[PDB]
Every structure is written in C-alpha cells, then in structure tokens.
Design a protein around this ligand. Structure first.
Ligand SMILES: Cc1cc2nc3c(=O)[nH]c(=O)nc-3n(C[C@H](O)[C@H](O)[C@H](O)COP(=O)(O)OP(=O)(O)OC[C@H]3O[C@@H](n4cnc5c(N)ncnc54)[C@H](O)[C@@H]3O)c2cc1C
Ligand SMILES: Cc1cc2nc3c(=O)[nH]c(=O)nc-3n(C[C@H](O)[C@H](O)[C@H](O)COP(=O)(O)OP(=O)(O)OC[C@H]3O[C@@H](n4cnc5c(N)ncnc54)[C@H](O)[C@@H]3O)c2cc1C
Ligand code: NFU
Ligand code: SF4
Ligand code: SF4
Ligand code: SF4
Ligand code: SF4
Ligand code: SF4
Ligand code: SF4
Ligand code: SF4
Ligand code: SF4
Lengths: 240, 392, 282, 240, 282
C-alpha cells in the first residue's frame, strides 16, 4: 500500500495528530509504504542539468494508493493548484484530511490585504476542484479517529468509512449546521455531546440546547459530525 | 558560474525554495532561502474581530507549535489592556509552552535523523523520540485543554485549573522525560561533534557560519522588557534578494537595530548560558542541550504551583484604541512576537506578527554561502524551519 | 421487533447500603455502582445530574461519594450529561470515568467512541456506561408548569418526583403528596423525543429502571463484558441485593409492553416525517 | 387575479412593506381580488354548530392564484403546519415573502425555553415542507422589489422572476454566502454594494472586501442576492 | 462581439474650467459633471473616492465643490464607492445623487436598481451614473510595492499616478518622474479582474476615460437619455470643450482594440474556470 501526505495551505497540525499515534505509528508505517511527504521523506527527487542551471525538484510520485491531503487551496497561487490536481491524478483514493481540506476551516476567513503576496485572498477546500473520496473534519481530527480511518481503508471496512465518504460530497462546514439540521428540525434532545466535541469551546448548553458563540467558531465541522441525530449508522449499535 | 535551485526542500515544516549561485566547483557564492507558501493573512482578517478570537485564530498558524502563538497573542492583548494574569495562571501558561517545546525538539531530531542516526539505531531512536513527545503532548493537553491548538490559553491567564493528582502525575512524567533526555543527549552530542553524517561524509568545519547576532528574551518563557520593539523594523524581500527572486518571497525581512538576527535555541544559550559556538552543528547541539533546561524548569514550576490558586484575571478586556500592546514568547524555534491594538469595545483595531523562523530565513540565505551546495539543506535543517509559521 | 436489544442477563436489584436507599429514586443502582467504583479504585470520576433549590439541573463531574448522594434521585428534565465528558478527562484528569444518561445520551456516547473526531484521549477512559430507562423528557419550564400549575406545589418545596401507575407524583418537603394523571403532561414533553427508538438504554454497559420491579427495586440489564465484570464485583462484595425477574412482579412482561409501545408509536412519527419531507437520523 | 396574504411565524413587517407602496397598492387591489388576509379581510367565514359550541371559523379559501406567505413554520404547532400545507394546495403560485419564509431568517435563532409554550423551538422556512415557486429575501424586502415581483408575476415576465424562482429552491441563507461564494472563489472585486444592502449594517468594507460581523447578521440574504458576481442576468444590461 | 456596448454618441471632451484641469486625471469630465450638477441644482450629493497622505482610499459622499476637487484624480486601487450609496440617500438626505465607479461598480448599481431588495428609496434618487474606463485594479499593498519597491518613491511623496504608453507612471511632490514597464505590475493586480467583461463601463449614463484622446482630454461615451440631458445642459452652459473622436488621435480605434483584447483574454479565464469547476456569474 503506497501512502502519501500532501500539504497545501494547512498548518501541519493534522500531520502532527497522525504522529500522536506514537506506538501505533510504527505499526502503521511498516504496513504501508510512505512514498511522499515533504516533511518526512526526500521524495521524489529529480535532477535536470543544463549549461547554466541544476534543477533539483521534489515531485509527487505515481502509484499512490491513499493520499492524505491537508489544507485548502489558494486560487491565486499556481503551485497550490498545480499540486491539488496533481495529487488527484496520481492517487487512487484522495482523503481530505482536516477541516481546511474538507470544508475550508479557518482559511474561510482569509480576505487578503497582507503583504507579501497581497493578491492571495481566495482559499477553497480541495473538494471544490477535485474529487474527494473520504473527508475527516475537525481541527485537527483526533489520532484515534485517524487510526480508524487508516485501518478501515486497509481492511476495506466500507461500512465504517461510509460516513466520511458521504461527508466528502459536502464542502461546507459551520456551527450553524447544528441549528439548521437539528434544533430547527425538532430533532435535538439535548445530550450535549456536540459541546464536548468542539475544539474552541464555542458551544454552550443553555436550556438543554446548544448555543454557538459565532465569533469563536472556526468551521471545523466536528460538532455536526458528532451529532447522533444527524448520522447514526447501525454499525454503532454493535458492542461487546 | 552556474545556478542551483532546490525546490521544495525537505524534512522540515512547510514549503520553501533554495536558489544558489555556485562556481564551477560546487561552492555557493550567493545564497537565497525563501518561503513560497501562499500567505493566509491571519493578522488582516483579525481586524474587527473580538480580542478573545485572536488566540483561537493565531494558534492555526502552525500545528507543531500552536502554543507559541496563543501565548504571544494573549500577552500582546493583555499589554494593550493593562491586564495582569494571576500568579498561578502565569505558571500554568509557561508550563504549557514548555510542554510544547518538549515535543518539538525531539520531533526535530526525528526529522533530521535520516542524516545523522545510523540505520540500525533508527527504530530505538524513534521509539525514544515518541516516548518523549508523548509526555510533552500530555502536558499541553492537560494544561491547555487540547494537545494541538489549546483553548485554555486566554486573555487573562489560563482558563482551567489542574488537580493535585494531575500535578503529581505530571511531575513523575517529567522525571521520566528527564531520563529519556539524558539518554538522547548521550547519543546525539557525539554525532554532532563528529561533524560526520551516517554515510561517512565529513562536513566542513565552518559549515553554516554567519556574521549576525542573536535575539532572546528568556531561557524558557518570554520578557517583553528585554527588547525595544521600536528598533524592530520589517523590510521587504527586495532588501535581501535580487529582484527576480524577491518577488517570490512570501515573508518580510525583520531586523533589530538595523541588522538581521538569528533566533532559536542557540540564541537563548548565547544570551543566558554564554554559548558562543558558530556553525550549523552548534545549533543542533544547543537545541539538544535545551531539552534538559525545559524539563527541569517544568518540574520547578510544578513545585511552585498552587493548584487552587486563581488562574484567570477579572480585569476587563478594554483598550484605548491606540496603545500597541506587545507580546513576546520564546517559541521552540525562537523569539516570537505578536502585536495588537484593542479599542474600548474589546475588538481588534490592528494586529501584526513577527514569527520566529521569519528572522532566520535571511540568515540562512547568508549561512549557506561558502560551502558546497550539497550541504545547503543540512544548514537549513539546523534552524528547524517552520514555514507555515514564518508565512502565516 | 427486538424489545430490549442485546443483553447478557436481567435481574431485579437494589443497593445494599441503606443510606443510598434513603436518597435514591428506585433501587439506587446508579449510585451504588458509582460509589462502589469510587471506593474500590474502579472509578476516579463519575458524571452526574445535580439540581438546585428550584430543580434546575446541571451536569457535573463528581469525585466523592457525597457528590454522588446529592445527585441521587430523578430530575425529569433535560440535563446534558455528555457535555462534560471531555472536561472529565481534561482538567479533572479522570482515567476511569463513569457515565450516566438516558438512552439517547448513551447513543451519543457510542457515536463519539466509534468516530472520535473531536474526542482525543476520551473513549479509552470510559470505564462504566450506565443507562437509565426513559420514555419521555421535558424542558425545565415544561416541568415547572406541571408541578406548579397542575400539581399546585412550588418548585422550591419539591422533595422528590416520580412517574408510576399512570400518574405523575410530587412529594413535598412538608409531607404533602399530590398526583396528576399522566395524560395531562403530554403537551409539555420535548417533541424531539417522539422519534426515539430506545426505551431500555440498549447500548449501555448496564441499564436500570423502575418498571418491572416493585417499589424500592430496579430492573437491571447486564449487557457488556465491562458491565459484567463491574456488576459481578459488586454482588461478590455484597453491595447489591439481587432477585431473578421471574420471581418479582410486575415482571419483565411490563418492560416488554412499554418498550414495544414506545417503538411502535414513535415509528409512525419517523415515517410521518419522511412523508412530509423532514429529516430523520439514519 | 386572486392574491392571498398568509401569515405564519412572522412579524407582519413584510405586509407593511407591501402597504408602503401607497398609491401603487390601490392599483394592485383593483387589478387583483384579495381573497384572504386575516389582517385585512373577514374571509372565509363559516359557522360550525354542534350540541356544545358554535364555532365561527375563518378558513383559507380555494382558488388562490398568488399566495404571499410571510413567516416561518413552527414544527411544534399543529395549526402552523396545517396552514402551510393548506396554503400550498389552495394556491397555484406560492411566494416566500421575506427571509423568515424563504430561508428562516431571525427565527433560525429560536431554541425554546420560554413560557408559555415551552415546547416551541423548531422553526423552518416554508420551503422545508412545501414546494415554493418564488422567493423574496430581505427583512423585509423593499416595496420597490415587491411591486416588481407582482407586476412581473401578472405580466408573465418569467425572465425577470428567474432569479427569485432559482432562490425558491434554496432554503439556507447567511452572511457567509458572500465569503464561500465570492471571496473564497476569487470573484469579489470590492464594489461594496453588498454592504449597502444590509438592513443590520453587519457588513463593513475592509481592504476592499466585505467583513461580516457575525453577531449582527440576521441571515436575511439581501447581500448575496445583491452580489453581481453571483447572479448577473443579461436582462440587467438592457437600459434606456 | 460588441466592443463598446450600446451608446448614443461618442466625443472627445475636456472641462472648460481651468482649475478643474489642474487637479484632474485626464479631461476632468467626472469632476465637471459633479460640479455642474451641484451648482445648478441637478445634484445635491455625489459619491467620490478620496485619498489620505499615503494614498489609501475611502468612499465618501461629497456635497461641496471643494470636496469634488480634492477627490479628483485616479487612485489605481480598490475603492468600494457603492458601499455609501444607501448612506447618501439616508443620513445625507440626498434626492439627486451622482454615482461614479469602474465598470463592475456600475454593474453593481444596475443590479441593485433592477432587484432592490435591500435598497428601499435608493434607485429613484440616482440622478447621474458616471462610469470610468478600467482595464485592471489593485489591492492597496499591491500598488504600494509597485510605487515604493519598483518605482522607488514613498507613497507620502506621490502627487499623481497614471497608466499610459505601455508604462506605469509616478509623479512626485518634488518634481521627480519615475516610470516602469507595465509587465512589472501584472503580478500585483486583483485576480478577480480576470473575469471582467466590461472595459468602457458599458452600463453607465456617461462613460469617460483617457484612451483614444490625447493628453488632457477624455473619450466620453453618452449612452442613456439621463446622461444625454445632463451632457447637453453642460455643453449649452459652456462647461465643456467637445471635439469629435473622428478628428482627434489616436482615436476610437485604439479603444476598440483594448476593449476587445480584454474581453478576449478574460473570456478565456471564464471558460477555464467553468471547466475546472469554479463558479462564474450568469
Ligand atoms: C427523564 C427520565 C425519564 C425516565 N423514565 C423512566 C421510565 O419510563 N421507566 C423507568 O423504569 N425508569 C425511568 N427513568 C429512570 C428512573 O427514573 C431512575 O432514575 C433509574 O431507575 C435510576 O434510579 P436509581 O435509584 O437506580 O439510582 P439513583 O441513586 O436514584 O441515581 C439516579 C441517577 O440518575 C441521574 N439523573 C437524574 N436525573 C437525570 C436527568 N434528567 N438526566 C440525566 N441523568 C439524570 C443522576 O445523576 C443520578 O445519579 C427515567 C429517568 C429520567 C431522568
Ligand atoms: C483602477 C483604474 C483603472 C483604470 N484604467 C483605465 C484604462 O485602462 N483606460 C482608461 O481610459 N481609463 C482608465 N481609468 C479611468 C481614468 O484613469 C480616469 O480616472 C478617468 O478618465 C476619469 O478621470 P477624469 O479626469 O475624467 O475625472 P476626474 O476629475 O479626474 O475625477 C475622477 C473621479 O473618479 C473617482 N475615482 C478615483 N479613483 C477611483 C477608484 N479607484 N474607484 C472608483 N472611483 C475613483 C474620483 O472620485 C473622481 O471624482 C481607470 C481608473 C481606475 C480607478
Ligand atoms: N517554534 C515555532 Fe513557530 Ni511553528 C516557528 N518558526 C512559532 O511561534
Ligand atoms: S484543519 Fe486545523 S489542524 Fe488541520 S491543517 Fe487545518 S488548521 Fe491545521
Ligand atoms: S449532539 Fe445533536 S442532539 Fe445532542 S445536544 Fe448537540 S445538537 Fe442536540
Ligand atoms: S462549533 Fe466548534 S466543533 Fe462546531 S464547527 Fe464551530 S468550532 Fe467546529
Ligand atoms: S425519550 Fe429518547 S430522546 Fe427523549 S430523553 Fe428519553 S432517551 Fe432521550
Ligand atoms: S422577514 Fe423580517 S420583516 Fe418579514 S416577517 Fe421575517 S422578521 Fe418580519
Ligand atoms: S450580512 Fe446583512 S444582508 Fe447579509 S445575511 Fe446578514 S443581515 Fe442579511
Ligand atoms: S457585492 Fe459581491 S463583489 Fe461586491 S463587494 Fe460584496 S461580495 Fe464583493
Ligand atoms: S477590471 Fe473589471 S472587475 Fe477589475 S476593477 Fe476594473 S471594472 Fe472592476
């Protein structure tokens, strides 16, 4: 199994969360073969020498089986868009890793105005440009949620991954997903688990309902993924 | 005469490029190390947002050291609002930043390990690194509320208190980390002193020499009074690169008293421990030596901490709309500055950041000069570059 | 249609500690498990639903036996117990956490364990998951109208409430007892409960309820191996008094009737929503 | 030729906005017979007598050509739902008048906990239950925009109404439409018209880009309707 | 493909008043129209784009002639002029408002006039809509690099900037003149301009620009009746010098070139976006 970590306009936090499997990471790294990851390996090096220049480039390799793509795409940066179409072509399964890649996340707030690239202002999730097969929300998703994705993908546990594959079709995330889809639809019973999932503590249970402090939400989508009144696959009911 | 371009450079955080004028022999005569990552422009979309949102947002600069930006953010906002966090809140805050550095430095030694650690020692070496990072991440998770991006770092102090049990568990976890550190130091310092990679290549003695000074305000936390911001000036990439390369740089060019300055572990050891060794290897050595300073300081914080003491200040978040608050913090990779102006409503009027690596990038351009170009990336990695940080 | 979901064994039980029986709602299973775990190193923190002088609820992470006792008894209003599940493993530093909740709250707990996106370090610290039976719940102001306007008792004077024998009961600090037919409470119940397909907390380690067992006892369902070890440790230590359901009246038959009544009624509501176009979980 | 004003969970502000056409309301009311409006006319009255009580009820009539529906639907009120389904079956053209009816608007923030109906907490736009033909955003939409809706509806000007028929298919609006569709997609040029449209002054031009103060946005959809980089039909190019 | 959209007549023109010519960019058409309207009761307010010491723009509602003269001149940076269009009708109390903007900003106007959801009382008070030609625009920091880092002049010393003859120009307060090839400015231009399909502000009552006319004159496209009545009132009162574009050089031909090249170049960007999946106006 050839795995690759592609880094676009992210922060590497999702990669660090993968590294926070520690002992499971050594297990994981010997079952798959990490062929590309600019932060970890020296691949893929290609040299082209003329009479005036020596070009040592690190390109994306081919045969990539699963590509963990982290961060959003900057439309005003040619390299950023060249690499998101590159990863799709050279990979069979493309995983939007984290809210930045899956739904925009914090980069939704980007508006530009800051040197040194004053023209950079338009950031979109990778799903707005290429096909996404699986999507992991959160900022960052937990290491435990990561090992489950990787294990299911290697064991073909398509029943487990269904919730993320369905999630790959949606490119928008916000705390208002709890209101629009649960509170407003007369489905919220007030368990409070959505509040416990939030990384910024933007959710506050009041009158038995979640109350989103909008100026603290980073649009990571962890709360709407957690709500058992949105998605509740039957496989969860199986416990030992 | 010939040009050498290495892009992207590897085994560090982010997306950068090397542009090297070289002679017919491989020796670089003019060096240029620059960021090309797209600029997200955090500081600019924080304008108008409430002050409490700043540490939440700037934490997303980078996931390797998010604690460094939340800390500098709340220190700048507190300074602009004349807020004083309580004794025990400030202790917890420094403990949180140390825990993060306890995970970054071993992480960096894992990223450089392909060069210096032999193949047969790799698995044992990585197990030790991960054992150390586990303890460091445990501290950020328990004090900061999350291991990556800590919500408890707030304007006013720290949001939550730890229990006497969490405190004891942390202390004995630090004693374990201290033993792992002595084991790791024993192993790496001889290799860095050898100046020989694991394939046998002996690096030049003056590899990475540069003629620039250092900035550091504290060995483990930060002190805004040990620097005069008025003397910090950000210039454009045209001041350090040629025109055709300068239009590619994504960062600014920070100076102090009118000169480039290196930041990071060697800068701190120069200012507090009299460590004056130049070159790339000496940087690695200072970072390794620092692991011991960090864990010792953490245990000293645990002894002084009162788990029942106040951690959040009651002072309100109001400003005058004019004062330029200053918040500095010694991130893993060096002196890290955030600035903020807060109005009477508690909203952000102006915001700016001068991140650690940003200082280091123009030094690296001059530090690769004088050596063969196939050593350039070894000099780059010595500075533990975090480009998402440098660009933000 | 499966009445009770999966389980290992069902038994009528009550706590052995008599102080517990003086403050608990039915048999005191929830408190007896929490207290036994805290005192014998099996639990270092437990989630509870406390109340104030006006019966307003608050989820809380208890660490002492007295906190557990003060949280005993049922508050028939919505209390988000899972909202503190991360705080318990963060500042509180718990690593053997006890969880209690209605079936929908246990469901949310299994969801966050299977897909722990925003629950780093949380699932592997859940040592005991205790579910309670539930037919309906109420907003606070819903109960306040039931108690103060239909039963004629101020909230500050309420000592205990209970549902049973087709009536809602209010017991006063001053010895009074008042009851109203359960039909007069229906317009006040949280509508979102009309799509719930779980009456006996079918996904918990241990489930407990008043129905099926006599007054002062609880119908208890052992389900998982984690709840099996915990339950067997308690009965060995003598912390519980167990009688087979076959011997007690009304018996398991009532539990089957009520469970299937809830599943059949609310299934019409789910199909009704699908018909008009409203979303339902799946 | 038979207009009806249905009032669900609204404030009547949109009806007042209609009344503020003044001289033009008396041409609308002689061009069109107003068959139902509880605030305006006493129809349709029927008397139901049983052994116990005499019930004088006002019902929604049949044969409504245009139905202006104002306000959202409360899923916990039987009468509220009964009226939205009644208005659909008895009208040929159903118009979602205002943000409450079209996308929820302020009523998205409802969550309950307030006597005297402690169970009321779930409010959805009419489009979530019935098929909507045309949708007018805003809180309230201007009187000018109202006369253009009615004139074009009576004249069969489908080209003009196309933008509102397209809107009737969507039931979710906010200030975030501007960011996810214009700023993030490298379409925003900084005209500032969206800031001028906001009824709550929640949009503030900064660095030539709209900045949404989320704590002020009431999700009326006036800005995203205005943005010429979202919808710019060729009909606008014909001027005198 | 139509080059200039629909129009009635096209002339070369310039303000008759000499003080206007001293402060304006080209022929002073915008300032002469605003000043004539204010002084003869055809306008009571006009939207302008002002600048500070460092060239940062601010959209403003002006009501005096001196406010119009101080806003004269081109600032090649984004200024949201339409953001104050409701402000002028509201607090300023205007009822004969003059508007100015680049083609995209004139488009934003017609849009709010046709579908005035959030523009109660606004459209009927728009008395004159003046578009200026535009090929590209820039974010402020984009222009700041061009002036300070490519032309070597501080913004605080800039007196005027102009685009012409394949070059960008900076005129200094102290007499200096610096210029660069326009290829040095392309990387800094607002990328959302690469979908613009309007060069001569085709939807305005009156359009004006520098292309086609010599230095100190403007090409002026009259399009609507409203701009025809206004223009004719101006020439009658002698407020303008008018020459046919048929006698002046370079001439309309250069305008038809530039307009078409732009439409041809940016239509390719629109089709590029459509194929890769990015949204475009329609
Ligand atoms: C809303 C509701 C409806 C119920 N309906 C039924 C029913 O139809 N049939 C049936 O047999 N049993 C029902 N129960 C459970 C029953 O009321 C008893 O609480 C249960 O048998 C446990 O009592 P105990 O004496 O064994 O333990 P106890 O010692 O009495 O402790 C009870 C525990 O439950 C927790 N708790 C109390 N109120 C709430 C609340 N609102 N939300 C979450 N946790 C809470 C407390 O933390 C406490 O520790 C219901 C409970 C609730 C809250
Ligand atoms: C970014 C930009 C690009 C342009 N490109 C071209 C081009 O390629 N070809 C061409 O012929 N003309 C172009 N123009 C217009 C031209 O430069 C003159 O502005 C135009 O001829 C009007 O000048 P004037 O002397 O007739 O009127 P003036 O008396 O000089 O007054 C001009 C008016 O325009 C307004 N204004 C100034 N800057 C801005 C701005 N940034 N946004 C909105 N309004 C503003 C001011 O309020 C002022 O009242 C451009 C203008 C801009 C702002
Ligand atoms: N260490 C560190 Fe950062 Ni990722 C850098 N460079 C920030 O404060
Ligand atoms: S989702 Fe969060 S942690 Fe992951 S790359 Fe984006 S900002 Fe970093
Ligand atoms: S998780 Fe869903 S059902 Fe539970 S409180 Fe949150 S929004 Fe309501
Ligand atoms: S409320 Fe919290 S969990 Fe939900 S999207 Fe916002 S930040 Fe993420
Ligand atoms: S009836 Fe169902 S949804 Fe309502 S409180 Fe009980 S378990 Fe939860
Ligand atoms: S859209 Fe606005 S004016 Fe119309 S009913 Fe709703 S709140 Fe009232
Ligand atoms: S920003 Fe203003 S116009 Fe846009 S949805 Fe919010 S309230 Fe409506
Ligand atoms: S109307 Fe659209 S293009 Fe104009 S400023 Fe607003 S978002 Fe940008
Ligand atoms: S080029 Fe077009 S989109 Fe850009 S500023 Fe000019 S008129 Fe607006």
């Amino acid at each position: 199994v050839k795995i690759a970590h592609i880094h676009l306009c992210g922060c590497t936090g999702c990669l660090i969360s993968l590294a926070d499997t520690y002992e499971q990471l050594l297990d994981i790294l010997n079952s798959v073969e990490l062929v590309y990851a600019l932060t970890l390996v020296d691949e893929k090096t290609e040299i082209r020498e003329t009479d005036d220049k020596i070009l040592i480039e690190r390109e994306i390799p081919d045969d990539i089986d699963i590509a963990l793509v982290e961060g959003s795409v900057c439309l005003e940066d040619e390299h950023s868009m060249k690499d998101v179409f590159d990863a799709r072509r050279k990979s069979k399964i493309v995983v939007a890793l984290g809210a930045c890649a899956a739904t925009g996340g914090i980069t939704r707030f980007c508006r530009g105005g800051q040197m040194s690239k004053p023209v950079h202002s338009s950031f979109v999730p990778i799903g707005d440009l290429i096909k996404v097969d699986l999507a992991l929300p959160g900022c960052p998703p937990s290491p435990e949620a990561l090992v489950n994705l990787i294990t299911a993908a290697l064991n073909g546990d398509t029943e487990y991954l269904e919730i993320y594959a369905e999630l790959a079709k949606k490119t928008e995330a916000c705390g208002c997903d709890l209101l629009v889809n649960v509170i407003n639809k007369s489905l919220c019973m007030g368990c409070g688990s959505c509040a416990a999932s939030c990384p910024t503590r933007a959710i506050e249970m009041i009158d038995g309902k979640p109350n989103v402090l909008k100026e603290l939400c980073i649009k990571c989508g962890a709360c709407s993924l957690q709500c058992p009144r949105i998605r509740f696959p039957k496989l969860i009911e199986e416990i030992e | 005469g010939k040009i050498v371009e290495i892009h992207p450079t590897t085994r560090h955080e982010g997306h950068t490029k090397l542009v090297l004028k070289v002679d017919d022999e491989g020796i670089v005569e003019k060096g240029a190390y620059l960021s090309v990552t797209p600029v997200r422009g955090f500081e600019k979309f924080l304008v108008g947002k409430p002050a409490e949102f700043a540490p939440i947002a700037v934490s997303r600069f980078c996931g390797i050291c998010p604690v460094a930006h939340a800390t500098s953010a709340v220190e700048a906002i507190e300074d602009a609002c004349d807020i004083t966090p309580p004794k025990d809140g400030l202790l917890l805050r420094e403990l949180c930043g140390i825990g993060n550095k306890m995970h970054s430095h071993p992480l960096h030694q894992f990223l450089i390990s392909p060069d210096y650690v032999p193949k047969d020692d790799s698995n044992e070496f990585i197990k030790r690194v991960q054992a150390m990072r586990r303890i460091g991440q445990y501290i950020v998770d328990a004090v900061g509320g999350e291991a990556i991006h800590s919500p408890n770092i707030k304007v006013g102090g720290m949001a939550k208190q730890i229990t006497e049990s969490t405190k004891a568990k942390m202390y004995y976890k630090c004693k374990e980390y201290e033993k792992l550190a002595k084991e790791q130091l024993e192993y790496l310092i001889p290799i860095f002193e050898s100046r020989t990679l694991n394939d046998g290549t002996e690096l030049p003695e003056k590899l990475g020499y540069h003629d620039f000074g250092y900035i550091a305000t504290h060995p483990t936390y930060g002190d805004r009074t040990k620097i005069d911001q008025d003397k910090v000036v950000e210039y454009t990439p045209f001041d350090v690169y040629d025109k055709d390369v300068a239009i590619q740089s994504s960062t600014t060019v920070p100076t102090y008293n009118g000169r480039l300055m290196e930041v990071g572990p060697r800068a701190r050891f120069s200012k507090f421990f009299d460590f004056k060794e130049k070159g790339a290897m000496a940087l690695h050595i200072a970072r390794a030596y620092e692991i011991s300073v960090l864990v010792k300081r953490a245990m000293e914080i645990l002894d002084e901490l009162n788990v029942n003491g106040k951690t959040m200040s009651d002072e309100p978040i109001v400003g005058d709309g004019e004062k330029l608050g200053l918040g500095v913090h010694e991130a893993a990779r060096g002196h890290n500055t955030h600035q903020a102006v807060i109005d009477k409503d508690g909203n952000i009027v102006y915001y700016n950041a001068i991140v650690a690596t940003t200082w280091n990038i123009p030094v690296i351009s001059k530090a690769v000069e004088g050596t063969h170009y196939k050593f350039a990336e070894h000099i780059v990695r010595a500075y533990d570059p975090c480009i998402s940080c440098a660009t933000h | 249609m499966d009445p009770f979901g999966k389980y290992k064994t069902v038994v009528s039980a009550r706590a052995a500690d008599k102080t517990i029986l003086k403050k608990c709602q039915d048999g005191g299973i929830v408190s007896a498990a929490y207290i036994y775990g805290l005192e014998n190193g099996l639990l270092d923190g437990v989630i509870v639903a406390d109340k104030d002088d006006k019966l307003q609820t608050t989820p809380k992470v208890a660490t002492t036996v007295d906190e557990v006792l003060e949280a005993a008894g049922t508050k028939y209003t919505v209390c988000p117990t899972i909202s503190v599940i991360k705080s318990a493993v963060r500042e509180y530093g718990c690593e053997k956490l006890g969880v209690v909740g209605t079936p929908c709250q246990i469901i949310a707990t299994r969801k966050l364990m299977k897909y722990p996106i925003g629950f780093r370090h949380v699932p592997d610290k859940l040592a005991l998951i205790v579910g309670i039976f539930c037919m309906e719940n109420f907003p606070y102001n819903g109960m306040k109208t039931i108690i103060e306007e239909h039963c004629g008792i101020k909230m500050e004077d309420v000592a205990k409430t209970d549902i049973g024998k087709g009536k809602f009961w209010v017991y006063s600090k001053w010895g009074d007892v008042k009851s109203i037919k359960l039909k007069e409470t229906h317009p006040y119940e949280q509508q979102s409960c009309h799509v719930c397909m779980d009456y006996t907390a079918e996904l918990a380690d241990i489930s407990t309820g008043s129905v099926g067992s006599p007054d002062g006892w609880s119908t208890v369902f052992i389900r998982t191996a984690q709840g099996e070890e915990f339950f067997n440790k308690m009965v060995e230590a003598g912390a519980l008094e167990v009688k087979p359901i076959e011997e007690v009246k009304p018996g398991l038959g009532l539990v089957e009737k009520l469970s299937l009544t809830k599943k059949e009624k609310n299934a019409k509501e789910i199909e009704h929503r699908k018909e008009i176009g409203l979303p339902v979980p799946y």
